[PDB]
């Protein structure tokens, strides 16, 4: 039997959740401290939660969240020296699993792009600040984007 479009999204989240853990090991060993901010979050109204269920709002905050969170990833991989490989694998194993969630969603379209010069802002802003500040950021984004995809792999099953 082999696997379903559901069971491939399934698994590949499963794979990046595994990578955020691989990666949280290498800049926490790397961190000094270690072993403003606004970061996609699912909400009730996104329809991903069990209270006001919502598959076709909810698919699009996936997709909407998973392409917000890129700059992010671009920040930990810029950043990263040690755990280069590790931080790019992230961003790749991201963006098979959107277009994945994009062939899904290929019946409802449209979908919020995040601005690239927006984006290109950002990044400089973050890289600016202090070790410290950019070590709790780093810390920040790993937690935030595990919780997004838990979230998700929830209500994708729930689908």
């Given at each position: 039997?082999?696997?379903?479009?559901?069971?491939?999204?399934?698994?590949?989240?499963?794979?990046?959740?595994d990578?955020?853990?691989?990666?949280?090991?290498?800049?926490?060993?790397?961190?000094?401290?270690?072993?403003?901010?606004?970061?996609?979050?699912?909400?009730?109204?996104?329809?991903?939660?069990?209270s006001?269920?919502?598959?076709?709002?909810?698919?699009?905050?996936?997709?909407?969240?998973?392409?917000?969170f890129?700059?992010?990833?671009?920040?930990?991989?810029?950043?990263?020296?040690?755990?280069?490989?590790?931080?790019?694998?992230?961003?790749?194993?991201?963006?098979?699993?959107?277009?994945?969630?994009?062939?899904?969603?290929?019946?409802?379209?449209?979908?919020?792009?995040?601005?690239?010069?927006?984006?290109?802002?950002?990044?400089?802003?973050?890289?600016?600040?202090?070790?410290?500040?950019?070590?709790?950021?780093?810390?920040?984004?790993?937690?935030?984007?595990?919780?997004?995809?838990?979230?998700?792999?929830?209500?994708?099953?729930?689908?």
């Amino acid at each position: 039997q082999p696997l379903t479009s559901s069971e491939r999204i399934d698994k590949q989240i499963r794979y990046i959740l595994d990578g955020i853990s691989a990666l949280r090991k290498e800049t926490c060993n790397k961190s000094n401290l270690c072993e403003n901010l606004n970061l996609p979050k699912m909400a009730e109204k996104d329809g991903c939660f069990q209270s006001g269920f919502n598959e076709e709002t909810c698919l699009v905050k996936i997709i909407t969240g998973l392409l917000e969170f890129e700059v992010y990833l671009e920040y930990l991989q810029n950043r990263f020296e040690s755990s280069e490989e590790q931080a790019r694998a992230v961003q790749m194993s991201t963006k098979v699993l959107i277009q994945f969630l994009q062939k899904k969603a290929k019946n409802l379209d449209a979908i919020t792009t995040p601005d690239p010069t927006t984006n290109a802002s950002l990044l400089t802003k973050l890289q600016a600040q202090n070790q410290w500040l950019q070590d709790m950021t780093t810390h920040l984004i790993l937690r935030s984007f595990k919780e997004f995809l838990q979230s998700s792999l929830r209500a994708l099953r729930q689908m």
